[PDB]
Design a protein around this ligand. Structure first.
Ligand SMILES: [Mg+2]
Ligand SMILES: [Mg+2]
Ligand SMILES: [Mg+2]
Ligand SMILES: [Mg+2]
Lengths: 288, 286, 287, 283
């Protein structure tokens, strides 16, 4: 009985409501998130693009850019990792299936696929386009059918709220769940009551994307729990703070000609070592 | 065709000492460029601890490093100096493949060191180094493998803490005589030593101004007085990014919301300007 | 610095038509170079069927191809023309990223086509080819993405098979006008048609002389009489390698030994000579 | 959840000896499966000479191999035994990461040998091996890193040509005592030797029946009589494939057409069947 990341993801859900899931930009941060107490983590598509590739979250990244990051993270962190699979990385059901089987094999616990057209955009940006309900239904069926691990999770995300309104988004969501989606990700919700309506209408775990500087208020876990939200996602929160701190170090070092004045903003060498279990490894080298 | 190595050598000519900052990923390479830096660095200790979440003990593979080189150089035009540890393999063939691959991936140069296979931070105790002759063979293999004459083969010696100053300088002399184009005397404890290395080899020397190690936090002015050609800050940004990320994780877990740390976050517009997001969205919308 | 694209263009002026053979992996690229070829090809059908064991229906990723490009060009100096299908993505950004990545991987040039998704690969006759304007957009994105000016951007279209000769020629002229540097018209069955395309666009024309298809096995002399600039043999060696490998598997399974098929095998020394084995091992012996 | 390693062990109990054929790429792995084989192999010499066009002298990296493992196992369900040379690095940490990475890539098992870093083919002269103690440490690290208990850690010894038979058997016993699950005595020259190894370690032994080497082309019956559990044909198909490819290149270059060699080619219909083409298209 080999370990199933997906099974571990489903177990975390039953032990935390809502289950907080934080984006981890790289393997180091996955370890930091685990040490902080989280029971599940996330690989943001916008993060693979903007962080790993330094590019816009506009469907430019490829499946392999993401797989590389999944392997790096799951090779060292035992937490179940939910992965952003954008639209499935291809225009046919064959692409969706390969995507699903590859991510399962890379170590992921689950993934979400959205109903946007090819060159997708952040769910919190204007002018997004979505495929037909039928089009998305086929994507979902292909994904579910491709599962090699029954516990791997196939989550459906809908970007329809801002484009077709709430009733339309709910109808799509119900059809997606009927097609096999196991959990639902209604993107960029503006009101708490909406989460409740979605939850009541599809009766499968609901995810709330609590990202900064977008269309969604910074709801607390208490508020989300009252709306029956199953999980709270913070996709790029740590990444945003990491970039500001790094930018600060770069600027000060450039203007001052030394980093002395910003040493107090740095994780210490010992802290890094403790994060990666450094001493236990070096000791083994010394014993040779 | 453009030569990153040529751009690196040109940067040395415009700035002395040339500040080179480690960039943990592509995003950070763009931030460094925007900050004014003329050259950047891909830390081996960072590929290990950041990209892999593992100790800087010769566990990473050539490909883990190649992946980060392509990601950074695909989007950032600055010449990238790359940490190639000992060449990734036990033979001269591994060293040669490492050089050719890194050149093709987009790097401007690399540094290879004289430690044994399972190397450790130059700022950690009990390191073990190979003989002067063994290192010379690694250097000769690296130099002869160059497919771009302007690519830089920098030799790093970890011998100061192991055999002493005189021995380390003797090794540096042999390394440069063998073709090493620049020298990286690791974990120097006194400012005066940099001057001695520089005088002894007559090639650009790099000072590794990393935090929490054996080397004082020398300023560019002080390094200039010691004839240092490059001042390297390998993981500085990374260390601050880690503390910031950790703080966000802790606050969110304790408070159930990130409201109280919003003021520590890079804004959406700042991120967008950093990755030229508007240039792309405009094209899509038109 | 060396430019594979420049070498490819040089080969074209020296050999006409230029024979370009598909090489399924690095080893075969070396065999092709030793056989005298001046340019080689990375077949999209071969990456799918050979490297992935999958049908040529748009399932392969850019990365799958890039891996093969690096393996081949890291060891073989011949200019490599690469099949880039439709750019590996939904937009001009994907097309641009594909061009830059392949150049960095070591390729000499690539061909991009006009199908919608993999609809043409799937033999759909209707709404399977993008509009002339959409393909022009793909071509412009690719040409503008070139980091090496000598890298080659070739346009491929099999519109003849669905829209007729006239429409195909009209698309080709628009593609070349948009910046396509060479043309790969697919599904041609008559020599005279190659001449018609050559006259219509006035840029090098590629003839796909693959086996078991609609196109006859035209000879280089015949292709020259039709003004064809290059002759492509995409999977020729691959097909022979598969039959030979299948034969070894069957005999070994039926007989319990490979004694009876030893005579069908490349010997150890022939392999060693192909990969310059001895020059390497000697260096290890004299450390 | 499926375990390739468990499948490999099962194949052994169902086929005696188990014929294991090297598959140079995913396509050939499907050909092997369609031909009736129950286990396949990823040759290190093949990854080097075929996928990279380089000598089998420790130049390939762990990732070069991992890429071929994923390509083969993503499409072919047969258990794949993988050549891991010496663990891909100078330390036990490298050996461990190699084991864990190969399991995740989809392999059923791997073999690690007792040669020095820049290793060479077991059928080449002048090989150098590490001490018995050094190999034992590589084996312990490898066994301890197993994330799937059914994944197989096979130890290979190249000591026969260097230290002789008794020394090779002594090393083999130490390797198995260290946790090696199966044994690969390389470049054996006499059938009887296999029996001596089998009697000495009592774990399944693999015979490397590669061509043009130090080992006679023993039949599966001869191998069974010597108590050999597995018969390996590492590059057999690869060798025939290269000669056939070379022929096509030469003829095409000399004749200006491939007409005269069409009969040596797998047909399009045959290729499509081998990769289940029509199975896809109608979906
Ligand atoms: Mg996303
Ligand atoms: Mg380092
Ligand atoms: Mg093709
Ligand atoms: Mg081998």
């Amino acid at each position: 009985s080999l370990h199933s990341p997906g099974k571990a993801f489903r177990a975390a859900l039953t032990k935390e409501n809502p289950l907080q899931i934080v984006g981890t930009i790289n393997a180091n941060h996955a370890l930091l998130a685990q040490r902080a107490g989280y029971q599940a983590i996330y690989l943001s598509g916008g993060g693979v693009a903007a962080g790993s590739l330094g590019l816009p979250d506009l469907g430019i990244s490829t499946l392999d850019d993401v797989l590389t990051d999944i392997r790096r993270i799951t090779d060292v962190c035992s937490l179940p990792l939910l992965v952003d699979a954008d639209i499935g990385f291809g225009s046919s059901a064959f692409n969706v299936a390969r995507t699903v089987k590859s991510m399962i094999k890379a170590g992921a616990a689950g993934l979400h696929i959205e109903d946007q057209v090819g060159a997708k955009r952040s769910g919190h940006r204007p002018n997004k386009a979505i495929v037909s309900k039928e089009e998305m239904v086929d994507r979902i069926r292909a994904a579910v059918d491709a599962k090699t691990d029954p516990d791997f999770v196939i989550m459906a995300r809908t970007d329809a709220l801002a484009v077709e309104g709430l009733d339309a988004a709910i109808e799509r969501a119900q059809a997606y769940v009927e097609a096999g989606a196991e959990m639902l990700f209604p993107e960029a919700i503006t009101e708490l009551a909406m989460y409740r309506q979605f939850a009541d209408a599809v009766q499968v775990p609901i995810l709330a994307n609590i990202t900064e500087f977008g269309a969604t208020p910074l709801f607390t876990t208490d508020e989300l729990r009252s709306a029956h939200v199953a999980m709270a996602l913070y996709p790029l929160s740590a990444f945003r703070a990491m970039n500001r701190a790094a930018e600060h170090v770069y600027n000060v070092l450039r203007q001052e000609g030394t980093q002395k004045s910003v040493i107090d903003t740095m994780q210490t060498r010992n802290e890094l070592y403790e994060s990666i279990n450094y001493y236990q490894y070096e000791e083994k080298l010394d014993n040779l």
